[PDB]
């Protein structure tokens, strides 16, 4: 409804007058063809409009038009399970109408208006509408998808289209007082949904991985980050992550990553299957991809996309699980945009905002309470990766500042084989503290006392081995060997699992607890042997250790019992000598 005419054309920037009353930052089809654009410095009756794609071929006299709408996300049911680009374009309607490439000048929608969903308008007309309020469900892979009002609306309900088929585009119910309401409603990326109470963290988060929670929890609503040079197994984790989870909605979305590996995600994703229903995994999933090459301001928005969409789902009461990677690359786009806008850089080369937009990406999360009065999980775990190759370049040490837990993964430890290879000695999580109450509630009650206790083991190996190991394990004394023998066990069981065993690749608190428990409990009595000067290198061959040796492989149904017999036997191997 506001139409302009092109005036100058300077690559990405274009300038066109015939436009006043314009609004800062919007879509806009520009060209005879038309392509999405963006208002930045307006002036008078013109604005500079940034038309993201390869501009090439435009002439002058082509009309310009605005939607008067900021770049927004479209949020409704049916979004899940598919693949999209930065500005939310679902690839399948693409593939058919392009063949190979993705041609420019394609318009679609997120949600196909061709599917007729059947539902229930879970209320009655004659009511009070309030923002954030309930409305109605359809099911899509076994979901209670509560289609809720967009917030900031309220009044009277009149007339309620009953159950039955409707395609998405068709409206639902209405207010007397003007304005209907469609099923889905759009949301600006920049703001964040208003929510009613942040709540303190104090809620666990499962991941099942031993090393993950017992030592370095993150808490649900937690926020972590993980670096990890590649060519070293880092994706493994990301896979397993979603596999068990503790949430139920998986959103994974990175953006840009040297070609082929970005395609790996795509392929292995459908093959994996939920291990909670036996339903195909892709069902409760939503992927956004974006590959290097892809248009600049695509990529810049990319994260933010993922962030919003996560909030949506969050808002519905579920617990969610976003993943994102290539945060290190994220800044890239930012540099680029700031290249084409002449604003000085600062610091190393990434403009300054990289202590804010980077910030906000993380803030939005924790333990939100909905306006719907329920609880919804938004942990983000921060992949980053510099083949700048340091724990010092801006990006990383920025994340580190805001988020709370750092799960360092490193190649070196990995080369010896032992996957996951989260290298413990360099990792940390400020988190633990506040988790302690719930910690002690649920697991055991001596529970903390164990984690701290066992960590010391490795610690007192680190600075012993370090030096003294250039003599082997035979010029050591008594207890000296004992530490590293035990150490071995911490490293041959408590550590290393696998992600290829139905028997183990998943746990629970209560399982690990026993595990660790036994390992102190065999060790303290190991020390009573050497304190009497008993044969040492005999302890090191007793059958008891093999009952540990199998312990990981013990299956979860048999797990209680397996402690039951095994444990008390420990008591008895020392009586023997």
């Amino acid at each position: 409804m506001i139409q302009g005419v092109i005036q100058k054309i300077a690559g990405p920037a274009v300038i066109a007058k015939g436009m006043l009353g314009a609004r800062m930052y919007d879509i806009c089809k520009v060209g005879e063809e038309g392509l999405v654009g963006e208002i930045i410095r307006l002036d008078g009756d013109t604005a500079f409009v940034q038309v993201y794609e390869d501009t090439s071929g435009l002439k002058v006299g082509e009309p310009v038009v605005s939607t008067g709408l900021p770049l927004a996300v479209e949020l409704g049911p049916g979004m899940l399970n598919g693949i999209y680009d930065g500005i939310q374009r679902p690839l399948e309607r693409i593939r058919e109408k392009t063949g190979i490439y993705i041609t420019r000048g394609v318009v679609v929608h997120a949600l196909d208006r061709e599917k007729k969903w059947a539902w229930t308008p879970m209320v009655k007309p004659g009511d009070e509408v309030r923002g954030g309020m309930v409305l109605g469900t359809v099911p899509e892979f076994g979901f209670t998808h509560k289609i809720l009002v967009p917030p900031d609306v309220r009044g009277r309900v009149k007339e309620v289209k009953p159950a039955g088929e409707y395609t998405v585009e068709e409206p639902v119910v209405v207010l007397e007082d003007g304005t209907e309401l469609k099923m889905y409603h759009t949301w600006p990326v920049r703001r964040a949904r208003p929510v009613q109470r942040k709540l303190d963290p104090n809620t666990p988060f499962l991941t099942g991985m031993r090393i993950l929670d017992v030592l370095f929890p993150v808490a649900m609503g937690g926020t972590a980050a993980i670096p990890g040079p590649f060519g070293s197994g880092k994706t493994v984790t990301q896979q397993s992550l979603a596999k068990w989870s503790n949430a139920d909605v998986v959103v994974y979305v990175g953006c840009g990553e040297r070609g082929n590996e970005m395609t790996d995600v795509l392929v292995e994703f459908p093959e994996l299957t939920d291990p909670k229903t036996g339903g195909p995994l892709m069902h409760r999933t939503v992927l956004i991809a974006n590959t290097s090459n892809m248009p600049v301001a695509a990529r810049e928005a990319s994260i933010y996309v993922g962030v919003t969409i996560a909030e949506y789902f969050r808002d519905q009461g579920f617990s969610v699980a976003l993943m994102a990677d290539s945060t290190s690359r994220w800044a890239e786009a930012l540099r680029e945009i700031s290249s084409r806008l002449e604003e000085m850089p600062a610091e190393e080369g990434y403009p300054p905002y990289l202590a804010a937009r980077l910030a906000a990406f993380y803030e939005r999360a924790g333990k939100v309470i909905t306006l719907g009065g329920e609880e919804g999980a938004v942990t983000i775990v921060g992949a980053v990766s510099p083949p700048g190759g340091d724990m010092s370049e801006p990006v990383t040490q920025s994340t580190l500042r805001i988020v709370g837990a750092f799960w360092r993964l490193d190649a070196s430890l990995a080369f010896r084989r032992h996957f996951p290879a989260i290298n413990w000695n360099g990792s940390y999580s400020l988190f633990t503290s506040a988790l302690d109450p719930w910690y002690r509630e649920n697991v055991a009650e001596d529970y903390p006392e164990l984690r701290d206790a066992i960590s010391e083991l490795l610690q007192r190996e680190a600075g012993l081995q370090e030096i003294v190991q250039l003599v082997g394990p035979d010029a050591l004394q008594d207890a000296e060997r004992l530490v590293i023998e035990v150490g071995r066990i911490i490293r041959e069981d408590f550590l290393q699992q696998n992600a290829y065993h139905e028997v183990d690749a998943y746990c629970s608190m209560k399982k690990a607890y026993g595990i660790m428990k036994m390992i102190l409990a065999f060790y303290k009595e190991a020390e009573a042997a050497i304190k009497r000067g008993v044969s040492i290198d005999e302890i090191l061959q007793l059958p008891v250790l093999e009952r540990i040796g199998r312990a990981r492989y013990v299956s979860e149904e048999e797990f209680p019992a397996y402690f039951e017999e095994a444990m008390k036997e420990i008591q008895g191997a020392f009586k023997a000598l």
Binding site: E342, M344, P345, A346, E348
Partner: protein
């Protein structure tokens, strides 16, 4: 090692600071070109 390390950084930050001013200085040149030729539009 931790010392000659400590030198190297020092190079980095100064080599870098060199060019901040480069750009900033250069920037101003543009400003001139456009302001100047805005009144070679004339009228």
């Amino acid at each position: 090692i931790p010392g000659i390390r400590a030198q190297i950084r020092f190079i980095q930050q100064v080599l870098e600071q060199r060019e901040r001013e480069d750009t900033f200085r250069l920037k101003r040149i543009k400003g001139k070109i456009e302001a100047r030729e805005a009144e070679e539009e004339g009228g």
